[PDB]
């Protein structure tokens, strides 16, 4: 099936308090594999996955350098942007970058990404063709000009289409057991009630991987969307996810509701009844 | 593997 590798960088300026806090994490699918934090002790790219631990010292040396490059680039950007918008020296602001590639089931190139965001809002992103840019405001346009002039897109394209892909395959292959797996959700249902007329019916999905899942309550066969409390998919902490939907049911109506769980690990979609 | 040519905005 499809696969993807993504890197996420966050830099928050600390006016007065010191140099901007920089965190960088990389993921292959829903599994985090490498990291870096400016406030950590090592000042090196660290392995956060057992399969990456096997990588040579040159990898860690070479990756520590480049990641530190990413750090310096953002440190500069924070101020550059403070200027673009004409903001105060005293304000803490954020810069965020995400980039990655997706391979199909044939493990070949599919799509490349690269997005930059300043203060939680889109700033500039590379268009799907990996040749042009989408700049939000006037500032983004300045940067757009800079990057078109320095032919940045042409270098990212060679990274996304080539090196990003090549490495993902490597990771997938060395991390086979972990990465190339599908843990279907272990479902079940609970019944809570603190009153003599209403009982809350909660449907669960635990120990599933990847994180993509669709959990839905229905009454007599009618989507129960607006009357359902759905919690955001949450990590278990061991490499799997959790999730749950809950509806308030008037006593006697229990047999009317049905929970519907959809997930890659499930051959056929499940339907749980309170029986 | 990370990208090797980030540029200032």
């Amino acid at each position: 099936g499809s696969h993807s590798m993504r890197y996420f960088f966050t830099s928050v300026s600390r006016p007065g308090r010191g140099e901007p806090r920089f965190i960088a994490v990389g993921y292959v699918d829903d599994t985090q594999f490498v990291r870096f934090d400016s406030d950590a002790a090592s000042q090196r790219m660290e392995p956060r996955a057992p399969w990456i631990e096997q990588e040579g010292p040159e990898y860690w040396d070479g990756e520590t350098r480049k990641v530190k490059a990413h750090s310096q680039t953002h440190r500069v950007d924070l101020g550059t942007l403070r200027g673009y918008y004409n903001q105060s020296e005293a304000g803490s602001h954020t810069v965020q970058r995400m980039y990655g590639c997706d391979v199909g089931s044939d493990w070949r190139f599919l799509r490349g990404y690269h997005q930059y965001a300043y203060d939680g809002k889109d700033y500039i992103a590379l268009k799907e063709d990996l040749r042009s840019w989408t700049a939000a405001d006037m500032a983004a346009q300045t940067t757009k000009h800079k990057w078109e002039a320095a032919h940045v897109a042409e270098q990212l394209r060679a990274y996304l289409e080539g090196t990003c892909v090549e490495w993902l395959r490597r990771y997938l292959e060395n991390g086979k057991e972990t990465l190339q797996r599908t843990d279907a959700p272990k479902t079940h249902m609970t019944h809570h009630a603190v009153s003599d007329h209403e009982a809350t019916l909660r449907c669960w999905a635990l120990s599933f991987y990847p994180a993509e899942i669709t959990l839905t309550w229905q009454r007599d066969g009618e989507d129960q969307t607006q009357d359902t409390e759905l919690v955001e998919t949450r990590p278990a902490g061991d490499g799997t996810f959790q999730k749950w939907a809950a509806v308030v049911v008037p006593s006697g109506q229990e047999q009317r509701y049905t929970c519907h769980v959809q997930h890659e690990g499930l051959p056929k979609p499940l339907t749980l009844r309170w029986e | 593997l990370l990208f090797g040519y980030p540029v200032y905005v």
Partner: T-cell receptor
Amino acid sequence: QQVKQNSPSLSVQEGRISILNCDYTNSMFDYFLWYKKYPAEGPTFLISISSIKDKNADGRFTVFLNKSAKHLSLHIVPSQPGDSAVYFCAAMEGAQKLVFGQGTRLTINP
Amino acid sequence: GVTQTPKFQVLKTGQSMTLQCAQDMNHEYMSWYRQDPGMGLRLIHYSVGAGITDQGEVPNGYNVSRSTTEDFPLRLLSAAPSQTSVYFCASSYPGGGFYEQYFGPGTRLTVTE
């Protein structure tokens, strides 16, 4: 991160073609380029090639990448006597690390 | 461009020596290489920017510093016959689109007993 340029020397009559070959080690090299060096001077950037392209050419110089074999090349056609120089094949591991090879003395004979 | 002094130098094993490298292009990254007959050029130390320095392939015997973005001086604390080579200084500005590196003229150095 080794870049191996076998064949230390090479002489080619004027007007003929001169092909300098190169091989490398780490799969972590993302940019490939060539430097030309004159005597008593520092190395000069000569031409580059992105990790994804196969060939590239700036008037008379053509670079060939073949990642499957981890081998880069440079074709100088037509070679002129001013071309005599030591040509260094290089590759970067990001933009803050350059790795050169042994270099090859090209002697274009008039 | 990138200038480096002296052009030629002779030292006796034990003498310290500092190679001067100056770039006037406001380039943030500067590096030090050395060319020997058998192995092309090799990186000694490099600096990604003012106040920052890190070792390369062959860093033993040399120290380096960067208190200014303009200069990157290469110190040999106590010369040895092995340090007999031609040294080159280089600079580039990566975070601005200049990945292509620029080399200074080079300084020949010979050390005798």
